[PDB]
Structure formats: C-alpha cells, structure tokens
Amino acid sequence: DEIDNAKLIMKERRFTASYTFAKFSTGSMLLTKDIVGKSGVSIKRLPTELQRKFLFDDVYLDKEIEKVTIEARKSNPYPQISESSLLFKDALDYMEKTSSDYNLWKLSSILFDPVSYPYKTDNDQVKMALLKKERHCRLTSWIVSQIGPEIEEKIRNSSNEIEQIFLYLLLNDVVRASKLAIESKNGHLSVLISYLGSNDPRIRDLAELQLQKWSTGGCSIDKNISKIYKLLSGSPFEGLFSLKELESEFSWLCLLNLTLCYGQIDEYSLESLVQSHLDKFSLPYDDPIGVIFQLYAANENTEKLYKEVRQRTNALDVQFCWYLIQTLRFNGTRVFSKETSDEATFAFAAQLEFAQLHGHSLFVSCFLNDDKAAEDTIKRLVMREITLLRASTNDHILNRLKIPSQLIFNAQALKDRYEGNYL
Amino acid sequence: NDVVRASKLAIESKNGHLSVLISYLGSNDPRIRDLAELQLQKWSTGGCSIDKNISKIYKLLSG
Amino acid sequence: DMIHDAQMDYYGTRLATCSSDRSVKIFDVRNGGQILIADLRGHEGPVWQVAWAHPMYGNILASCSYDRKVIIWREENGTWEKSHEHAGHDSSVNSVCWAPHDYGLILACGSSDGAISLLTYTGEGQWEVKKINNAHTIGCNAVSWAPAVVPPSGQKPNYIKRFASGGCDNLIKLWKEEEDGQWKEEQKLEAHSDWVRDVAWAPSIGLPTSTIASCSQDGRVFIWTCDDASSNTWSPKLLHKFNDVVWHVSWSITANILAVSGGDNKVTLWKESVDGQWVCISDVN
Amino acid sequence: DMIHDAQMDYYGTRLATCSSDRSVKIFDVRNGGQILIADLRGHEGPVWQVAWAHPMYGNILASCSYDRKVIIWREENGTWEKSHEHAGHDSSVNSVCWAPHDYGLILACGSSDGAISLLTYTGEGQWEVKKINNAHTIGCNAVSWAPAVVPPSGQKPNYIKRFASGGCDNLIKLWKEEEDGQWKEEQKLEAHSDWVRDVAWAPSIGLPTSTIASCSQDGRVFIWTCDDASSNTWSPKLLHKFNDVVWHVSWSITANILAVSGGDNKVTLWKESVDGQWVCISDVN
C-alpha cells in the first residue's frame, strides 16, 4: 500500500534503481553514496598527488617566506609578491643527494641560478666571460659525477690501454688520461691531450688533415687513436670520422658531455651550444633531467617550449613547473607570460588546498598577477579556513603575508558567529 | 699538475670561482693574467683577510 | 533505505541529508565521524535535493520535495524549527539552490509543473515570490546559480544576477534578473536528445571564462564554454557518453574537476587536459 | 611472475602463453580448466607476443622475443619441437601475426630496429624471407593483417595482401604486396602524438567498410576508417583518451567490440553506437 508510490514516483520520474550521486563540497571533499555511513554518505576526500615530503613542515614554508617581499596590489589591499630571491638552490637542503629530484633540482640550480664573481673587478668583457665559463665547468663538472659510475666501471673492462685513455677523456680527466698515455709508450697523445683543453687551429687542422689521409689504404689503426684525434678536430659528432656511432652503449649524457667539452665547434653562447647536441641526438623519453635541458636550450622560445613540453609529459612535477616559472621570472632569467604563469600558479596553489596546507596555498596564491583573481581566491580561502590559519600554525602567517586587516576581522567574526549558534 | 682533482675539490667545497680560474690556468690568456695580478695589488690595501691559499693560487695565474 | 541528495555545510561542520522516506536528517561530522542531530520530518512525499544557506544569515537549510512544498529550517540555539514554508507550485519540486550570498538571501526552486519560484527574503518572516511559469515544457529538474560577478560612489554593485536551469524539454535555459524586477530567459541550449538531468554552473576561479556542465537521459555530459564578448555564444563540447543515464554533476572548487555521478552506480572524476579534451581522473568507490 | 601476451588456439582448445621469464607455455582448456602441456623454452630474452597458425597447416605456433629471434614450433603426435627459427633482425622483435589462411602460411614480424620480416613457407623445411628495412623510424611495435578479401577461370585469386603496422615514430603505416614481389608502404597515418602501441585490423563481417584500431603512449584510441573499397581515404575518429598509456587493443569477432587494454590495469569494452560515437559497455575484472 506504500510501495506503489515509490514505484509510481520512481517511475513517473524516469528513476532507475540505478540512481547514484556525488557532490564536491566547500572543503574540497566529495560525498559519494556507499552504505558505509550512518546515513549512507561516503564523505571520501580528494587526493593531493603532490608527493614531496618537506612541504609538510612549517620550517620550509616559514623560512621560504623571508625569501620574499610582499606588497598590496595596485587595485586593492590584497598582497602580491614584489620581490623574491628564490633559487632552485634553496630547495636542495630539504632533499636527499641520491634522489633524481636532487639531480633535477641541482641541475636547474646550475643552468638557471645566477653565477657570480666574489670580488669587484669590472672589465665587463671579463666578468661576462668568467660567469660564461663558471657556468660551463659547473655543468660539465656535474655530468662528470653522473657518468662517474658508468665510465669508471666500464674501464675495469679493458685490455686495451689506448681505449682506456679515450675513456678518461670522456670523463674530462686529462691529468690521468695523459699519465696513462706516457706510461704505455704512446706519448705523442699526451701532447695532443695537452692541446685538447685549448683552442688552437694549428692542431685542429693537423688533426682533421690527418684524419682525411687515414681513409686511404692505411688500416691497422686503432679506432681509439682515431676517435681521439676526432676529439681535436672540433666538431666530433658532425665529422669526417664521426662519433655518432657511440649512441650504442653510451648514455646520451655521456655524449653531451663531449659536445660541451671538445665540441666548442664555434665560440658562442652555451644555451645555443647545448641545443646543438639535441639536434644530432634523440633524448630519453619520460626523462625530467632531459626535458629541463630542452628548456634551457631553447633560449627565447622558453615559454613556447614549456607549453609544448607540458602537453606531452607528466615528468615535470606541478610544484616544479611553478618553482621554475617563478625563479625564472624574478631573476630576469627567461621570458614568461602572465597568462601562463598564473595558469600554473593556480595549479600548484590548488594541490596545496587539497592537502589542506592553506598556509602554502595562500602564499603561492600571492604569485598571482590578476589582482581580481588574487583577491578572489584569498577572500575565499581565508573566509573558510580561518580557525586553521590561527593560534598555532606559527601564530601569525596572515600578518606575515600582508593580508587585509579587515578580511581577517570579517571572516573571523563570521565563524565565531557561526559557532555561536551551533553551541 | 692535477687540475682535474684540484677543480673537483674547489666546487665541492663551495669555492667555485676557483674552479674557473683553475680552468684558465692551463692556458695563456692575458685577460686572466691581468685580472689576477691587478687584483693582487688591490689585496695589499687594508684587506689582508683571505686564505694564503686563495692568494697562492691567483699567484699561479700571474705568470 | 535510499538517500537522494546530501550536502555538507559551509565551514564543513554539518551534513544535511534526505531520502525517499520524507526525512531530512542533519548529521554532524567532527573528525570524520557521523552523528545525527535532528530528523526534520514534514514532507508528504520523498525529499529531492537540499541546500545550505550562507552562514552570513545564521544557520539555514532548505529542502524541496515531491510534496510540491519547499521548507526552510532556521536554527536558534539548537532550535531547529522551520521559519517559513512555500507551496507555490502545483507539481513536485525537483531542485533548489541559493543565490550567491551577495545578491542577498534568494532561493531558486524548479518544479515539475514547468515553473520556477524565487524566494527573496525581507526584514522579518516575510518572503516575496517572483515566479516563472512555463519555464520548461514538461517540468524542470535542475537549477544552478551563476557565480556572483562584480560589474566611484557609495554603492554595492547591481549584479548581472543570472542562473541556468535544465529540464524535461532537453533545453538548458539561462536566466537573468531584468533591471525592472523580473527574470527572463536570456538563452536556450538544445544539445541533449532527452531529459536534462542536472546542470551545474562551475565556480569562476576569478577567471572570466565561465563554464557550465549538464548530464541527461541520453547519457552525455556537456561542457558549455562561453566567451561572452557581450553576446550569448555558448559552444557545447562533449565530455563523454555512457550507455546509461547520468544523474548528477558537480564542480570541484579549485581545479574545476567534474564529479560525474551516473551510469553504473559508479562515479567518475574529470579534468580538462592541457590539450582541451576532458579526461577521467579516476573511478570512485 | 608477469605474462605478456597469451592467445587461445583456433577451435578454442589450447591456450599458448609467454612471460618475461623467456618461457612459452601451452595450456589446455577443456571445460574451463587450465592444464599445462609443455614449456617451450628457448629465448635469450622475454617473449613478447605469440600467435597460432591456421589448423589447415597442422598445429603451429610462433613466438617472437627480445632475443631478436623468432621461433616456430610445429607438432607431430605430441612432438612439440621447433621446425624452424629465424633471427633476421638486429633488435628485439615486438610482434608477430599470421596472414589470413588463404594467402598461404605467411608470418609477419616487426622488430625494434625498425624493420619487418615476412616468412613465407615452401614445400619443405624451407622459408624465404622478403624483408622491409627502415619501415618505422625508431622501431616497430604492432603488426596486424588486413582481412583476406577476394577480388571466369581456374584460379585462386590474387589478393590485395595488405597489413597495417604502428611503431615508435607515431605513424601507423599500411602496406601492400606489389604484383612483382615486394611490399611498399601504401600509406602513412599520423594521428598519434607518441609511440603507437598496438594496431588491430578489425575483421570484415563480410562488410566492405574495413576498419582498424590503434592505441599509443598519448593514451588515445583511434578507429581509423575507410569509407569505400579502393579510395585511399583513412579518416581517424577518436574512441577515448585516458590519462595513462594503452597497451593493447583487440577486436571481438561479430559485433566488432573493442577490448581496450591499458591505463589503470583495467580493461574496457567498446561498441560503436547506432549513433556513430563509441561507448564503453562495461568494465572487466
């Protein structure tokens, strides 16, 4: 007598017994129906796939805040970042030296973090040339450590000393590469190896001019003695006796180190140099250290590549992308569009919201250019999570972020008011 | 005459600028040479507070 | 037995619910644990949807129902009594929603007779009801409010006061508060081949590219993107189609993730890729 | 530990399998119960895909592998010995497939060096190998045969003998046996943004509207179509995109249901609706 309406209405309403439902809520939690709730409301929560431990400790957020200068925007009292001395470097301490992150980070910190003389000499032709180089070593010196196990061990495997030498070069270790040369009664090399580090055309030509001759009825020559002269010619990969063959067992990075050490084909910019390597060789798929290079390599096209890149790979961590754009934007380092920046600031500031770490969210939120949006978010974020942003999160985050005196009092008053009746 | 290891150490101790000079050390570039010496002269005025080692090294550049 | 809609309170403290047994239960969730607090009974028919008003007006919660009546329950010190009731429609009332807190305390209700009432609140226990007859052909199911958007003087701006709404005619009509006082149908949206089930006006992340989602008996979910360069040009885009009906759709706040409820008792999550095509992030349950 | 590919025998009696442990196991399924019958070991590297030849040639089964070699195991009274082997490629061999039983007993293999061998069978234990170098840029992953289609005399027709094939360059190149003797790439299909994983030539239900499915790292599944016989027109249509890679794709025989393997360890089924849009009929597992 009561089931016919449930049937009538269930039916007069196109309602299958399959009817389910789910709705996200203010805190960002969704309410699925499961039968697991006193009233069947599975209030599951939203996963912050943002995996990086240090984000959960006051210290980082707290300390990284002193790294900035906040100032109310031009169209309202809502704070926005004026100046930020933020470098990839900063992050290194909170990570561990064995993770790929430390690398990705340590790398960027090298490719983008500013270089600097530690004494005031001003021949701009000089200072500009030093930093030019400081950045050079810094990077090769790194790859030397990344290919250390790789090559070092690949050396235990050789009966051939000449091949052994070519290997020591591959690690940019001339001193030991030379010692070996003399000790094996293969001295003439110790000489070239001497020149290798410099840029002398005499040699260069002496090398190449010889190479050409070596292709005419003159065999029984080590592939190693040849490969080595090749390292003198200048461009080794685009050569008359190319090394492009090495792609077989050498880490692409092993090769790159070559083009950066002996491949100074022309005396120009590094960024463009790196870029030269990328042209002859295909890169490792899904690789973060890889991508980061393309970004460095594609100088002015920076933002364009980024867009291009993010559209194909999940290798670059939201938080990274953000920290990138930001460290690059506040150092003049590259060319980044307001639309694209804020575009990725939301991204991050969002993950930080699902995690509930509002302190971080609000802070990243200041990296918003659109004064309307900034205000828009901030008012929202704070109005809902005031209690959480109060008494112990360090006791003042909000005053620290130059947030509006009124907003605080307003949203505050509102909850006290809310709790007021609940009691 | 062990630049490779002398350099590695330089970077690893947060004393990089040296790894740069050390780079030049092997060659013969007057820019540097002068940059070195010209600095040295300055270092004798009021500021005698640097490692004897950082000095000894620039000295190796002077010529 | 089976619940219909249940929505968390602002400040995430309570959790009102309603099921086909005509019971509007308000459960508290402190620490993740559910704890009933009152069973507001009062509908002659199953309750459909339910919505919490903005804490700025105290603690209010309204519930509509198949009983053709809608109830508003206030709260005064634990005193969960109903301060007002409204039976202005002849057929069941499929949905309710509150207007963005700035417009005031306005409540929108779409019935099944094909109408739409709008309870505005006044100084005391009074409520005027500007109504919209024959809004949809066979009735209305969804009612969603367009996000409050602000347009040299001492004034709180006059907003565009819009609010979309799907129904049994397949049309998702948008609406607008005419400067004089009544609402008119700014535009129709006919992309669905059968009953429109739910229509949700995604919240603007400050961003001007206002969106809106809809799901219907045909089993398709559309996202009407709109660049209102002063003219109504709503270009629908297909999210996905399941061989079974989709019952509800909701927007996650920050990312604009769509929770797609419908089909196989399963609920899905979606996010529009850096490419423009929407994707399923995961399967709930 | 983990298997890769496993295919049921014609007449649904056996069930060959292979996993990364370099072991090609042939089970038998009478009544639904699995029962091993032999563990053909012989690959220096994990076995990738595996295919059963047509009972018309006795009982044959071939398996390719990362060992750059491909094996063909005959059977003579329980005598599961290998009658032939072929290591004509330098890099691993991602896939194998047999040509429709009418062309004869031809086997197609796509390596990772970017080549494609084609073992035709002769009177005795002899096998000629017309090969295709640099077929794909970075290697090949999929190889599927185009359904055997028949074109006043005593003759078994000369077929169009086509067979598609995806690879690491993102292109799904179709191919054809030129009347003289060698295959040529009739056409390229570039719709994928990353590695093409698998490419399956749907069987023609006698119907001339030949189709083909593909899935790749980008996580999209396309069902390329040809509107008519003899018009070099392949118009791709998007099935769906998952945020994760799709590993395999297969056609169900009658309905042309697509089994989509990939993404979240889940496998999906799809059937093209009376509307043209493809839908997910259910979730396996």
From Swiss-Prot, chain A:
It comes from the Eukaryota. It is a peripheral membrane protein. It is found in: Nucleus, Nuclear pore complex; Nucleus membrane. The modification Phosphothreonine is found at residue 16. This is Nucleoporin NUP145C. The gene is NUP145. The chain holds residues 736 to 1158 of 1317 of the full protein.
From Swiss-Prot, chains C, D:
One of its GO terms (biological process) is protein exit from endoplasmic reticulum. GO terms for molecular function: identical protein binding; structural molecule activity. The modification Phosphoserine is found at residue 165. It holds the Pfam family WD40. Keywords: Acetylation, Cytoplasmic vesicle, Endoplasmic reticulum, ER-Golgi transport, Lysosome, Membrane, mRNA transport, Nuclear pore complex, Nucleus, Phosphoprotein, Protein transport, Repeat, Translocation, Transport, WD repeat. Gene3D superfamilies: YVTN repeat-like/Quinoprotein amine dehydrogenase. The keyword Thylakoid does not apply. SUPFAM superfamilies: WD40 repeat-like. WD repeats lie at residues 1-37, 42-83, 88-131, 135-185, 191-234, 241-280. Transmembrane segments: none annotated. It is a peripheral membrane protein. The GATOR2 complex is negatively regulated by the upstream amino acid sensors CASTOR1 and SESN2, which sequester the GATOR2 complex in absence of amino acids. In the presence of abundant amino acids, GATOR2 is released from CASTOR1 and SESN2 and activated. Coiled coil: none annotated. It is found in: Cytoplasmic vesicle, COPII-coated vesicle membrane; Endoplasmic reticulum membrane; Nucleus, Nuclear pore complex; Lysosome membrane. One of its GO terms (cellular component) is cytosol. At the nuclear pore: component of the Y-shaped Nup107-160 subcomplex of the nuclear pore complex (NPC). The Nup107-160 subcomplex includes NUP160, NUP133, NUP107, NUP98, NUP85, NUP43, NUP37, SEH1 and SEC13. At the COPII coat complex: interacts with SEC31A and SEC31B. Interacts with SEC16A. Interacts with SEC16B. Component of the GATOR2 subcomplex, composed of MIOS, SEC13, SEH1L, WDR24 and WDR59. The GATOR2 complex interacts with CASTOR1 and CASTOR2; the interaction is negatively regulated by arginine. Belongs to the WD repeat SEC13 family. Functions as a component of the nuclear pore complex (NPC) and the COPII coat. At the endoplasmic reticulum, SEC13 is involved in the biogenesis of COPII-coated vesicles. Required for the exit of adipsin (CFD/ADN), an adipocyte-secreted protein from the endoplasmic reticulum. This is Protein SEC13 homolog. The gene is SEC13.
